[PDB]
Amino acid sequence: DAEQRAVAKALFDAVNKHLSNPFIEVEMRLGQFKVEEDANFTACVSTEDYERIKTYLMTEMENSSMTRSVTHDVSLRGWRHTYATDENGNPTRCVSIVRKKRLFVKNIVVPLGAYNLRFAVSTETPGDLRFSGAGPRAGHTRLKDRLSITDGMFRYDMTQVTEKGVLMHEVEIEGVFSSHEKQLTESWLEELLRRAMRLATLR
Ligand SMILES: O=C1CCCc2nc3c(cc21)C(=O)CCC3
Does ligand 1 come within 6 angstroms of the Cβ of 97? Predict the structure, then answer.
């Protein structure tokens, strides 16, 4: 609780220099190390821990605004094209192209038995929509079924991702700001840690 105030300060001092950038994004991702063979950190939760994080979140903030969206992502030469989805789950029309550049990443120390936490600040710069002419299947694809709960300046993202047949579960919290420069504060970061640590520690 005092040590949590210190981490929040350490995070703020590292990222403050970046908030002047347009299109800045901040997120905390639950995950684990050495759960797949090619990767170090994998941003995923078990099917069981996903559904009780879902039950927790949906009772604790039932008043909160909520949305659900199915989208079709295709990665192409470092850019991400997002496609809307029809009844069956198939790509229709491209809705956004962004390029994501990681500006700062930090691994958060967690309690024993909890999911690992990864804090990242990046830029997601929108792009020229005429590149959508490459179509929804010009590269590796990800079908995302996202549940989104917004609570003040915090958005919870629970996503069932189907890639290459296998389905995985992702849990992240993002910053929701009218202006990241003014609003993303140290006291905000400390609440991010507090809320993210809650999710990581059930059971
Ligand atoms: O929108 C832009 C800006 C110009 C450079 C650029 N290059 C690529 C894309 C998008 C953009 C893609 O969507 C994937 C292919 C490479």
Answer: yes
* 80 Cα–ligand 1 center, Å: 9
The answer to whether residues 23 and 123 touch, using CB atoms and an 8 Å cutoff, is yes
Other Cβ atoms closer than 10 A to 37? 5
- Please tell me if the CB atom of residue 76 comes closer than 6 angstroms to any atom of ligand 1: yes
DSSP string for 148-159 = EEEETTEEEEEE
Q: Burial of 47 by CB count in 10 Å (0-12 exposed, 13-18 middle, 19+ buried)?
A: exposed
Structure determination method: X-ray
Identify the structural domains of the chain with CATH numbers, from first to last.
2-201 (3.20.100.10)
Give residue 20's identity as a one-letter amino acid code.
S
Relative to the CA of 97, which ligand 1 atom is closest? 13
List, in sequence order, every residue forming a beta bridge with 150; answer none if it has no partner.
Answer: 65, 155
CB under 8 Å to 128, separation ≥6 — which residues?
Answer: 97
For residue 27, say whether it is annotated as part of any ligand binding site. Answer: yes
Q: Compute the Cα dihedral for 42, 46, 47, 52 and give only its sign.
A: negative
CA of 152 to the centre of ligand 1 (A): 34
Phi then psi dihedrals of residue 195, to 5 deg: -75, -40
User: The tokens of 51 are what?
Assistant: 């559904």
Q: Which residues pair with 29 in a beta bridge?
A: 118, 172
* Separation CA 90–CA 116 (nearest Å): 33
CA distance 133 to 157: 29
Cα–Cα distance measured from residue 2 to residue 121, given in angstroms and rounded to the nearest whole number: 24
